[PDB]
Amino acid sequence: TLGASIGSTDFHYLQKDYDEIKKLNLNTWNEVAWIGDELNSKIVMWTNSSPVNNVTLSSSDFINENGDLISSNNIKISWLKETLANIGRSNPSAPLEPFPDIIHNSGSLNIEKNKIASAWINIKIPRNAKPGIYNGSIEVTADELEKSYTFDYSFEVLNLVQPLPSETNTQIEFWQHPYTIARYYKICKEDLFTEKHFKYLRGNLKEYRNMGGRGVIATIVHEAWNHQSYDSDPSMIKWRKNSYGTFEFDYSHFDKWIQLNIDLGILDPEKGFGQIKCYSIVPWNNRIQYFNEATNKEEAINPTPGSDLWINIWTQFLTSFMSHLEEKGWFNITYISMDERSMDDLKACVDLIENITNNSYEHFKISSAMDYEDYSFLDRIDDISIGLSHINHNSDDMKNMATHRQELGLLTTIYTCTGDYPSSFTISDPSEGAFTIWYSLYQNTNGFLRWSWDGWVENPLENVSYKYWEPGDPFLIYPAEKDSIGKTFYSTPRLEKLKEGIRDINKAKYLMEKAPNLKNSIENLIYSLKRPNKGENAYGSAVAASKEDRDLTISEANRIKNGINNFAREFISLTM
Ligand SMILES: O=C(N[C@@H]1[C@@H](O)[C@@H](O)[C@@H](CO)O[C@H]1O)C(F)F
């Protein structure tokens, strides 16, 4: 009636693989955690000819050798919900297949005949948990099921404390799209950035904060990315050309958005913690749009970057914006940002921003993300992000540039997007994200940027397909059901793997400071990282170059994590 086994969180259990999945029989799991850490696992279940109703998974408490308790309340077991994804990229003919990308709800599930269904297991180790080897069990029952399943779980909690994100130097930046969340939840224009809107922003922003999120995107012009996404990108700063004929700037949305992020502890502008990333002085395809009171219509202009028109406009804005930010106590964390723009384009922004100054001797910090590989010029950009496919693994150019930038107190990250492998798509193996984070440390960068926190298509919970990109590329979280009372978002295996990677690179860095006698050995481990090459599937999506490369991504991420935890054991053995 019902089959069950522990499954890996590294990859998806797909319906198409029913025949193979049916063969699984793993009944134990063990892992290593620090105090304040989290672990993940998964149970995969399958039906045969009969449907099975009221399938439930229940956790025992977790008990260490001393009898100390980690309550079953710290263990959340959530069904993985499938959604439909076109498996291609810009390929409407590609197969539309289901993927268990959504960490959905706890409680009971009815499963139809001849089906795979899996449940994600999230284990939180309290920040005051006692060290030790903790044992517990997860039981699977269902109405029809004669013999229930009990799976035996253990985890060792090492006597070291997982760093708080504030206590690390990890840089994490995921682009938020609060007007997309408004659209999905039918928040009207009149209620934008009111508590009615915040209802649906607060919880996912706390999720972002809690995993290490520091960067906060804000749009400063209309349609900065030329409406590449399903949803428009409105400006948080409204532009009007008035009756006399001058430009006015309405900062209301900007202010309410930023203050929210301050209130939640993502930004701290007095303290220079976090970033405000203002996109952009170079909108994609150059259009600057504004409401002209004469002629009363919306209007636009196409100035190419650098010109006198361009200089004066952005001067104007940057001037107002400066004063505006000085008013707030915010100016020190504000970056003017550019997304994959020309080298010649960047030239201008550095020059114009050079000029706009205040009586205090202060300057607008600058940010650029590049889809392309002498620091004279780049040193004038305070935060740069380089795409993974543009990092040559067989050169030290990246690592040397990032080492240099760090010496100057500048920011450097890596990003992934459409066409990358490893990456963070619905179709990706979730372990690819943990690899991605490790790779940011291998290249000696500050961390990881991704354009895609919450860029929902129409109804992600049922279909994720979009005209462009691999499926799921624009969002790392799902919305909740539209009418939901309570829940406002759901996480994903791929997001949980990015979280894991972040925790673990934070471990490595903590250990290299705490254990000088082990630092070189830790570094040797980190710099042993192998890199899979990329290929494409038949439908245009990036994938591993081969089965061997695909398996390498997974094995490497595990090898490094386990290495670091075994070094932690050695240091603990030392300082006892
Ligand atoms: O991710 C970035 N840029 C673009 C995005 O704006 C979007 O086009 C994305 C689609 O996967 O491709 C990224 O390269 C960022 F690195 F600047």
Automatic annotation (TrEMBL):
InterPro entries reported for this sequence: GH123_cat, Glyco_hydro_123_N_2
Domain Glycoside hydrolase 123 N-terminal: residue ranges: 6-141
Lineage, highest ranks first: Bacteria, Bacillati, Bacillota, Clostridia, Eubacteriales
Coiled coil: none
Annotated binding of N-acetyl-D-galactosamine, by residue: 168-169, 214, 228, 417-418, 473
Protein name per its UniProtKB record: Uncharacterized protein
Residue stretches making up the Glycoside hydrolase 123 catalytic domain: 175-510
